[PDB]
């Protein structure tokens, strides 16, 4: 009916769905793959956005975050890896994304989490936000702990993928 | 290929906070159902039958939402309704204690069930079924809260 209406995205059923998961990915860990991974059964496209200039200097570089990135998630095949220097609104905007994936580990987050969405809800009010609990396997792990514990001998095997693994003992001697 | 999900709730009553989460998820996924639990523990204002119809009438105008009572285990209902995922709404922080151990408990009883969380528009963050209740209880104006068909029927279990 394309000569009468274009359609719109709010109840006229299901629409076709591209998400965002951002994030400074500082390196990847099991608990980002596992978020994506069950993301990227639910929506159509899932785009892993890597924040190119996090306020706190990352131990590896964008393009080596979105390398390790890349490898360890090249066997989802709606997935993709890119880095993006702006507002996540922004990229979502430029990316015609229409998903917002968001991480929620900790019940101190969830306030900063929900005046994000509102944020984003004023920026973008075609982006949903969605909220995804870790698994409980991964939901004490976080990429500062792991390089903190590696950085002192701890084994952290169990909680990167072995690409990551290799590239994080490389950065600590 | 498709997505299924069901909105789980005592739904007593449906508020415009609950049917702005189940619109922004029928956007999303191909299926919606509003699963009203049939019987909680703590007895409701309307009865199973009366927040069905209820729910029905307010969510007719969303093609790919069914809404459908509910007397057994989460997983069981979804697995007899193949649905594959579940979606909550989010408003406070207490809850959301209680709905990871959920989660995290549905988790071991159907791994293929993905477990989803909206966080409510602005507008609708502080309203709740049982807060609008104990305002119309005393008088005070929930029109805006409301749908119409919801508010007439609040009105008159009041009156």
Same mark, same amino acid.
């Given at each position: 009916?394309?000569?009468?209406?274009?359609?719109?995205?709010?109840?006229? !059923?299901?629409?076709?769905?591209?998400?965002?998961?951002? !994030?400074? @990915? #500082?390196?990847?860990?099991?608990? +980002?793959?596992?978020?994506?991974?069950?993301?990227?059964?639910? &929506? #159509?496209?899932?785009?892993?956005?890597?924040?190119?200039?996090?306020?706190?200097?990352?131990? &590896?570089?964008?393009? =080596?975050?979105?390398?390790?990135?890349?490898?360890?998630?090249?066997?989802?095949?709606?997935?993709?890896?890119?880095? %993006?220097? #702006?507002?996540?609104?922004? @990229?979502?905007?430029?990316?015609?994304?229409?998903?917002?994936?968001? !991480?929620?580990?900790?019940?101190?987050? %969830? =306030?900063?989490?929900?005046?994000?969405?509102?944020?984003?809800?004023?920026?973008?009010?075609?982006? =949903?936000?969605? &909220?995804?609990?870790?698994?409980?396997?991964?939901?004490?792990?976080?990429?500062?702990?792991?390089?903190?514990?590696?950085?002192?001998? !701890? #084994?952290?095997? +169990? @909680?990167?993928?072995?690409?990551?693994?290799?590239?994080?003992?490389?950065?600590?001697?």
């Amino acid at each position: 009916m394309a000569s009468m209406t274009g359609g719109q995205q709010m109840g006229r !059923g299901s629409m076709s769905t591209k998400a965002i998961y951002p !994030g400074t @990915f #500082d390196p990847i860990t099991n608990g +980002h793959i596992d978020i994506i991974t069950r993301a990227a059964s639910m &929506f #159509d496209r899932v785009i892993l956005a890597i924040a190119a200039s996090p306020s706190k200097k990352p131990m &590896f570089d964008l393009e =080596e975050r979105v390398a390790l990135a890349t490898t360890a998630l090249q066997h989802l095949p709606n997935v993709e890896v890119m880095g %993006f220097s #702006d507002l996540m609104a922004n @990229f979502a905007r430029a990316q015609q994304a229409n998903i917002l994936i968001r !991480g929620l580990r900790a019940v101190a987050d %969830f =306030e900063y989490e929900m005046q994000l969405a509102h944020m984003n809800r004023h920026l973008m009010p075609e982006l =949903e936000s969605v &909220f995804l609990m870790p698994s409980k396997e991964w939901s004490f792990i976080s990429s500062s702990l792991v390089k903190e514990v590696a950085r002192h001998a !701890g #084994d952290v095997t +169990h @909680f990167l993928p072995a690409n990551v693994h290799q590239a994080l003992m490389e950065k600590l001697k």
